[PDB]
Enzyme design. Sequence first.
Site, PDB file in Angstrom:
ATOM      1  N   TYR A  18       2.702  -3.636  -5.207  1.00  0.00           N
ATOM      2  CA  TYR A  18       2.310  -2.691  -6.242  1.00  0.00           C
ATOM      3  C   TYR A  18       0.811  -2.493  -6.130  1.00  0.00           C
ATOM      4  CZ  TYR A  18       6.753  -2.633  -8.831  1.00  0.00           C
ATOM      5  OH  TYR A  18       8.061  -2.432  -9.215  1.00  0.00           O
ATOM      6  N   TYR A  19       0.152  -3.460  -5.495  1.00  0.00           N
ATOM      7  CA  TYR A  19      -1.260  -3.366  -5.138  1.00  0.00           C
ATOM      8  C   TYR A  19      -1.426  -2.551  -3.845  1.00  0.00           C
ATOM      9  CZ  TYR A  19      -5.965  -4.741  -3.676  1.00  0.00           C
ATOM     10  OH  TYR A  19      -7.288  -4.723  -3.299  1.00  0.00           O
TER      11      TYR A  19
END
Length: 287
Positions: A18-19
């Site tokens: 998600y980063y």
Amino acid sequence: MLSHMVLTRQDIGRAASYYEDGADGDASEWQGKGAEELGLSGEVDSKRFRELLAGNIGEGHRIMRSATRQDSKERIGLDLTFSAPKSVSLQALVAGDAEIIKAHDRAVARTLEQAEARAQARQKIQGKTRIETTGNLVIGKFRHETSRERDPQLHTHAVILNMTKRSDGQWRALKNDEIVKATRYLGAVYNAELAHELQKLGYQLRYGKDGNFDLAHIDRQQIEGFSKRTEQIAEWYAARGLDPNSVSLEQKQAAKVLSRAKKTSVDREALRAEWQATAKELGIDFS
DNA sequence: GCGCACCGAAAGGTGCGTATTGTCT
């Protein structure tokens, strides 16, 4: 829109990816009193985030959640996903307006403060269990810009880690009942805050139902042209002979997940140009 | 879910289920 997902041990790879996605402030960001307490602020370090996902709070602390049953799943967090209305995504990402992105970030932040106020834990004294309201969370926020179908889609994964500091100063798993059971409400906060922010920047709004809005000078056809995933969901209901106006939660999730086709990493600078060409074709006037 | 039953082995803590509108990672 606000959707939620309880995250388990099997989601460790999805949650860390998600980063932060190099795309188009700061794309990833810590929030929470819990986070502040742990010395965490500004950009999310992805290595520290993984450790926190695993219950490794570090700085002279035991690994958390060892009391999880072998027959149950370890919970690594709670994902709150804030998605802006499509017209907002369009102004922000096709036309390119940093102010709208900022307005989205603020709506998220202020909503998450209300989610944090609802953080809870338990304590047991002599076999008698008490629920406390802790009021603190450790959150990693990761902003993203595209949909599964490469449409402009301004959204933020707020990954609430599964940890909160109790009344006695002890770190324990999050009792998520008040956040999870307040999703409909927290979504209204996001909408209300975003709308207030856009009005402060002089945008006129047009209203939907259940509190949804869109920028006034982008219409339904124009929104539809950038909502391919929605079209795929509509077709799924039609194919199953289902009525879009009265479907169960279980059938909503089926249409959502199974209507997904797999796409492939694309030239991100070439994508904007296509968005712009599309907006032109749909006759969109971005003021 | 108010407790339950089984984690680790603190007469303590955890998932469990919760719940989810449209724009639909």
